Amino acid sequence: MKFKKPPINNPSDDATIKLAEAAVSVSDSMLEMAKVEKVITPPSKDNTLTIPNAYNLQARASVDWSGPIEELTARIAKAAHFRFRVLGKSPSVPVLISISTKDESLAEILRDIDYQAGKKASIHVYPNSQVVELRYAKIY
Amino acid sequence: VPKLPCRVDGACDATIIKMMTDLNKKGIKVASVGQNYLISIPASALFADQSPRLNWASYSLLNEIAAFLKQFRKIAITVTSYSSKYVSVKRERALTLARSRVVSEYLWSQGVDSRIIFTQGLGSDKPITSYTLGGDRSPNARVEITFRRAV
Amino acid sequence: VPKLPCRVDGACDATIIKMMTDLNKKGIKVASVGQNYLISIPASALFADQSPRLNWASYSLLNEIAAFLKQFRKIAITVTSYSSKYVSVKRERALTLARSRVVSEYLWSQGVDSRIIFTQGLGSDKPITSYTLGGDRSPNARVEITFRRAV
Amino acid sequence: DGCCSKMGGINYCDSSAGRLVCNNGFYSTCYCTRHAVMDLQFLMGCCLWHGGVYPQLNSSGLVVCNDGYVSEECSLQK
Amino acid sequence: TGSLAGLQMALKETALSVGAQAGLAWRAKIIDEQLNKQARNLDAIYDFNSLVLEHNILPPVLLEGRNTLNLADAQSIRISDRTYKVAKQAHFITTPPTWRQYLWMDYVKPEAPKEIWCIYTERGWKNGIDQANTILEENIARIKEDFGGMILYRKLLAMNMVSPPYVSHTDLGVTGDGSEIHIDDRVLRITALPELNVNSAEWRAAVAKDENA
């Protein structure tokens, strides 16, 4: 009648223990402040108007990228069979993004890139002309 | 020299030639033109009769293909699925998309070190053979995995 | 190391397993889910026929249970008593309260190192079995001692 | 020596609690770090409940604590 | 010694000195391997890139304390409810910081070397392992300080207790002499640093609801 309790995993390292303990506190500090920001300034608009979908924007991709924005967006547009467009001057300090997802449509990849770009760049899609457009901000 | 690496890790030319030869005798078509590589798989060796459900024994073949794909260095892979004409255009477009989604997920679960995997399903739009008498036994219902070797 | 303690004192894993096994063969139910522990005792092994008077021989069983409880470290213990339906609701509420008071006092007299002991008696309100044919011989007249192991 | 005896042996040291985990899912009774809750009630040394020993070296045998009290008890007799 | 009836070393330090270094180096290697295995999760967690302000300005680092008491001496005490302090000031950057300058531990392979030799070499091994774990824990505290100070800045800017940095840019035209030209000179300079405001009448509160059923 040997007694056992269900989760029996691989052994753990105390470095990973300490890293996890720091990460939990980082996560809930982040959660509380995101609550405060959402309450203080409620958003009103959504980037589905600037990036609508189309046929053959529904092919799918899984991506793990940590570089500048232009090469990844060119690869996405070329896979979607669209023309690629750049407006404005690229800044001297590069615009870096970091995407690590699994299995979503190309339109959603583009919208997440658009959200992570922030105040530095923007993405627009014209489906009647089949054009993906990246425009840089007039800053510096 | 003793502390720099002397080759890309886990990779050997004899192993590449051996596995390419074994795959060609088994029946999976492996071709290379320039630096582009194509692996073409018949759908009967992977799926059931037009359902997106793998057999249990075909995971050994997917494991073998993943062990082949770990030998190179690459940036993007494309997986595209094609089928044969059964009911409408929509049913096989959905079928090929589901098949490509499942296969690319298992390949991503194994450790292929790619940055992007694109998946699409073209239905029965692009046949490579005018003999269309089989069902899923037809030679033009297949999945193709294409990539470019980088440097 | 020679002057720090190397374990919590008077405690051993083999002794815990040994006493838990012996208690389960004797008939007292010992269960553990996560870190919560439950000891369930039938009322016939402790009391007379619905009176709050212990037999003289059941103090060995209470001593054995106290020797089990000294193996852990804990903050609160709860003792709750339940009985079967005899006369009114009040008579068995009073009976279960008296039974729990006596048992928790003897446990506190022995050296269980807890900070709080809570005692309550619920009467015959929460049965664990639909077969209600016995008297005090019924399986649903019992006392339960529950706690959480702390760190 | 034998911490997880009549269990499967030692799995790992949980440093969040300071305890060993056995190969069944039970916490052990053995400690594995010094920041574990040990129930210390008896401590050695002198000039406790003062500042500790003021570390000058003395010609005589008096031991003086950091708050001016003099330990006659740890002091050598004549 | 004890009851009335009871009343009736150079290899030592050389063993500790070779054990401590070997334990420290070995544990440092294992720590680096564990850090390199989990490299994508730490980049996702410590995302400095998405905290950067408008003109590529790193936000200031702020610190918070609550429920404060000081007993200054006998006869005087001072208490306060909260206190806020600017630990580090904002500045221009060209690249964002990364976790590797905080968490990476340094390895150099030590190749510079019997009755009781074994036990003390083993004890030195334990001492070196414990020292390495302590060093890693202080590094973790430091990275948590930088990220938490910046995150706290974002919350107080939202709740209107600090001022944002103010930046001015000047546009020169085509400048230079006949030996060298620069086509579009622009000079950027931040003229007001962020700072806490002591006027409490403009402060803005945040009340977060929950609604169900």
Next chain:
Amino acid sequence: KIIDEQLNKQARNLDAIYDFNSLVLEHNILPPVLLEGRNTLNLADAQSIRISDRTYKVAKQAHFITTPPTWRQYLW
């Protein structure tokens, strides 16, 4: 050693007896220490004596504390 073992055995009774925590004044101020003597005589020298009935003295003055005192700083 034997004295310390006897002190550690009886640790709850001494905390109940020397209860400094329930003597503390309003703003966490320790009360002053006062001393009493009764029926006092002093023979200063030959030719002079001085007598008194009671005398009271402030041995220690009140001050702020953060923690109350405990018996362990005295008896250990």
